[PDB]
Design a protein around this ligand. Structure first.
Ligand SMILES: Nc1nc2nc(C(=O)NCC(=O)N[C@@H](Cc3ccccc3)C(=O)N[C@@H](CCCCNC(=O)OCc3ccccc3)C(=O)O)cnc2c(=O)[nH]1
Length: 263
């Protein structure tokens, strides 16, 4: 019932990855909510369960497949299926716990991790921060295999956590930010794996704050500036939505849009 988007790391190109991310965004947003040229994800409040999730089916050169489940309200990876087993991160509330029972309903084995799925927890379990975890087609290929083999004991918990970190950034963060999609496109173009620079990390950490600042802005003007980092780690101040139009592709719903105001 939930829409499925397919991607494979096997012979992945800039174009095939671009098509994939475009398709993910298309299934995440309805077109009902666009503010300062930037689409907003569906509001969680009153969202029917039949419209709550999308599925990302990842295949690799090793002929293995995993299916990630993404929450449409924030592009969050809530869990995955590999063959006869499904695994979900610890839900942050009771409603979300009910929501995930609607995912992978025909699967033989259902597990909920005792840990939540945020970066901080995953980095703890991985024994590495995002800044030291390589991204690219190679890492993704390896991540798909690692997710696949977890249920049989082939994958240790640090490797699994690392693999989630790779998937989340190359799928969800790329969907959220054209800038991050661009950084992944470059890695694919040259088949060169590398850890994300400070511009990537600071964008990831600031997605909620940027979403709120844009949505609460006065005609696009921020009340408070947001500090980001450049590739070299130097500070970049954001005062306005304008500079973010080429950078951010999707926002999380934070508030209702203000009336148009007739002049
Ligand atoms: N698994 C996963 N983990 C992720 N973790 C992060 C992450 O830690 N980001 C660091 C950060 O500073 N996040 C901001 C911005 C942000 C990012 C992503 C989403 C919303 C907001 C924040 O305010 N982050 C919040 C925590 C928001 C957690 C949303 N959780 C969720 O929707 O759970 C759904 C569920 C249902 C069933 C089972 C299991 C999970 C905070 O720090 O207060 C991002 N994306 C993801 C992601 O897409 N998938």
């Amino acid at each position: 019932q939930y829409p499925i988007i397919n991607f494979t790391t096997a012979g992945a190109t800039v174009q095939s990855y671009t098509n994939f991310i475009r398709a993910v965004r298309g299934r995440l947003t309805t077109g009902a909510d666009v503010r300062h040229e930037i689409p907003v994800l569906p509001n969680r409040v009153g969202l029917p369960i039949n419209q709550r999730f999308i599925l990302v089916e990842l295949s690799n050169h090793a002929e293995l497949s995993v299916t990630l489940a993404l929450d449409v309200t924030n592009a969050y990876v809530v869990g995955y299926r590999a063959g006869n087993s499904a695994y979900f991160f610890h839900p942050d509330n009771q409603e979300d716990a009910e929501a995930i029972t609607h995912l992978f309903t025909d699967v033989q084995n259902r597990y909920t991790f005792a840990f939540g799925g945020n970066y901080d927890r995953l980095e703890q379990l991985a024994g590495n921060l995002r800044e030291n975890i390589e991204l690219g087609n190679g890492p993704l290929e390896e991540a798909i295999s690692a997710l696949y083999y977890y249920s049989t004991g082939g994958t240790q918990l640090p490797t699994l956590a690392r693999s989630f970190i790779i998937c989340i950034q190359m799928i969800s963060e790329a969907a959220r930010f054209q800038y991050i999609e661009g950084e992944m496109r470059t890695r694919i173009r040259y088949n060169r794996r590398s850890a994300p620079d400070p511009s990537v990390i600071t964008l990831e950490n600031s997605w909620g704050r940027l979403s709120t600042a844009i949505q609460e802005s006065n005609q696009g003007a921020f009340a408070s500036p947001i500090q980001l980092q450049r590739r070299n780690g130097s500070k970049f101040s954001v005062y306005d939505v304008s500079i973010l139009i080429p950078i951010i592709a999707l926002m999380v719903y934070r508030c209702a849009p203000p009336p148009s105001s007739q002049f």
